[PDB]
């Protein structure tokens, strides 16, 4: 039968919305750091599953090997970052990815308008939004041991949606799908991806694998 999914729309916190507009509509050099930020978030999620384990082993589910996979798709013009980390519940998506204020957001915008490099974004507590330096749309599929699978999505414009994902089960973890802008297709190339992982993510404590078509 036909599947049905409930969709909820949310407004980004005021300053997060301002930061996204700034990011999308201003030229910045060194945009490649978006990958470092996404890999760091996967690394953090993998640390969480590691610390959640041994303590409470009787609640372990999905995935198996703790790792990060990078999957560029030239045909679809997408770059996907997949991890087997802890994942996020529906409440986590809503709270952590848009609705709650970050104390460093205003400071970061002030810094950028005065010439700071976008690379500092991670240190101001808003690293995820660096995804919009290269993506026109971002989809996040996630599955946490304590909830069902959900899909978060935003093309900016001040709001994002969250819905139950009835599509292919992904197992415990998170998948960030970047729909790359027309002028940012260099990030689909094997050599370029290897270059930036070596330059900015050469110390992550988990296996990172690049799948090349
Ligand atoms: N791969 C992921 N797995 C689980 N949670 C994630 C993932 N990526 C982002 N998140 C959530 O989004 C929040 C915001 O990330 P970010 O903007 O990079 O800030 P920070 O890493 O400083 O918390 C993270 O704290 C985490 O709760
Ligand atoms: Mg981060």
């Amino acid at each position: 039968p036909m599947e049905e999914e409930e969709v909820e729309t949310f407004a980004f916190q005021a300053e997060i919305a301002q930061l996204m507009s700034l990011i999308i509509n201003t030229f910045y050099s060194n945009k490649e750091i978006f990958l470092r930020e996404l890999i760091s978030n996967s690394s953090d999620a993998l640390d969480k599953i590691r610390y959640e384990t041994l303590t409470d082993p009787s609640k372990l589910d999905s995935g198996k090997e703790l790792h990060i996979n990078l999957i560029p798709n030239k045909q679809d013009r997408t770059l996907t970052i997949v991890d087997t980390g802890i994942g996020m519940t529906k409440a986590d998506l809503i709270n952590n990815l848009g609705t709650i204020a970050k104390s460093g957001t205003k400071a970061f915008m002030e810094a950028l308008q005065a010439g700071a490099d976008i690379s500092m974004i991670g240190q101001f507590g808003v690293g995820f939004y660096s995804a919009y330096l290269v993506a026109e749309k971002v989809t996040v599929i996630t599955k946490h041991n304590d909830d069902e699978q959900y899909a978060w999505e935003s093309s900016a414009g001040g709001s994002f949606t969250v819905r139950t994902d009835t599509g292919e089960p992904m197992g415990r973890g998170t998948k960030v799908i970047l729909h790359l802008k027309e002028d940012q297709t260099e990030y689909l190339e094997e050599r370029r991806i290897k270059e930036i992982v070596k330059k900015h993510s050469q110390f992550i404590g988990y296996p990172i694998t690049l799948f090349v078509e």
Side-chain angles (χ1 to χ4, degrees), residues 114-145:
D117 194 87
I118 23 71
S119 183
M120 300 285 304
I121 191 167
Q123 286 198 107
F124 285 81
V126 285
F128 175 81
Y129 305 96
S130 63
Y132 293 89
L133 289 169
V134 303
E136 56 204 353
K137 181 170 61 183
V138 179
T139 305
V140 179
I141 310 300
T142 192
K143 173 67 179 77
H144 181 106
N145 292 344

Side-chain angles (χ1 to χ4, degrees), residues 37 41-42 44-45 83 87-88 96-97 122 125-129 174:
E37 292 302 325
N41 284 339
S42 286
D44 292 350
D83 69 65
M88 296 175 269
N96 304 330
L97 284 183
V126 285
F128 175 81
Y129 305 96
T174 301

Side-chain angles (χ1 to χ4, degrees), residues 186 188-199 210 212:
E186 62 189 86
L188 297 166
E189 285 295 311
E190 47 260 72
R191 202 230 64 157
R192 184 65 174 136
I193 299 173
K194 292 200 301 188
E195 176 178 33
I196 66 184
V197 169
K198 180 53 177 178
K199 195 183 299 166
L210 172 60
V212 281

Side-chain angles (χ1 to χ4, degrees), residues 16 27 31 35 49 102 132 134 166-167 202 204 206-207 209:
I16 296 302
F27 171 80
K31 296 185 172 75
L35 224 213
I49 200 58
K102 290 300 162 285
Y132 293 89
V134 303
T166 54
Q202 68 278 77
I204 293 293
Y206 300 97
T209 310

Side-chain angles (χ1 to χ4, degrees), residues 18-197:
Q18 302 172 28
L19 172 65
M20 288 175 81
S21 286
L22 238 202
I23 285 178
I24 287 173
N25 298 299
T26 305
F27 171 80
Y28 293 96
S29 299
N30 205 29
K31 296 185 172 75
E32 69 192 52
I33 63 89
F34 75 93
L35 224 213
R36 183 195 67 211
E37 292 302 325
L38 303 182
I39 286 177
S40 292
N41 284 339
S42 286
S43 182
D44 292 350
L46 291 164
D47 285 339
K48 289 185 174 72
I49 200 58
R50 229 173 83 239
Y51 283 85
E52 183 152 272
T53 310
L54 53 158
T55 307
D56 302 282
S58 34
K59 61 176 205 178
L60 305 191
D61 288 302
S62 291
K64 180 51 71 212
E65 335 68 29
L66 303 195
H67 62 31
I68 304 166
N69 296 338
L70 305 183
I71 314 187
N73 184 302
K74 274 289 180 187
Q75 4 309 123
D76 306 340
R77 207 173 83 180
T78 60
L79 172 64
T80 305
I81 298 83
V82 181
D83 69 65
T84 50
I86 194 150
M88 296 175 269
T89 63
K90 187 184 108 176
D92 290 337
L93 276 176
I94 295 164
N95 294 323
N96 304 330
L97 284 183
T99 293
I100 299 175
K102 290 300 162 285
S103 67
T105 315
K106 294 187 192 200
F108 188 51
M109 294 191 287
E110 201 181 67
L112 286 179
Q113 299 181 104
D117 194 87
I118 23 71
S119 183
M120 300 285 304
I121 191 167
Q123 286 198 107
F124 285 81
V126 285
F128 175 81
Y129 305 96
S130 63
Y132 293 89
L133 289 169
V134 303
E136 56 204 353
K137 181 170 61 183
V138 179
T139 305
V140 179
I141 310 300
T142 192
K143 173 67 179 77
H144 181 106
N145 292 344
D146 296 32
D147 213 334
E148 68 191 297
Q149 194 167 299
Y150 292 96
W152 176 106
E153 200 172 86
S154 185
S155 289
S159 71
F160 64 99
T161 56
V162 173
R163 70 196 66 194
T164 43
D165 185 21
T166 54
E168 183 161 344
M170 66 155 280
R172 187 203 70 227
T174 301
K175 162 203 301 185
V176 176
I177 310 163
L178 304 178
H179 294 77
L180 301 182
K181 301 167 187 186
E182 53 157 34
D183 57 314
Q184 305 299 149
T185 64
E186 62 189 86
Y187 298 111
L188 297 166
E189 285 295 311
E190 47 260 72
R191 202 230 64 157
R192 184 65 174 136
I193 299 173
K194 292 200 301 188
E195 176 178 33
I196 66 184
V197 169

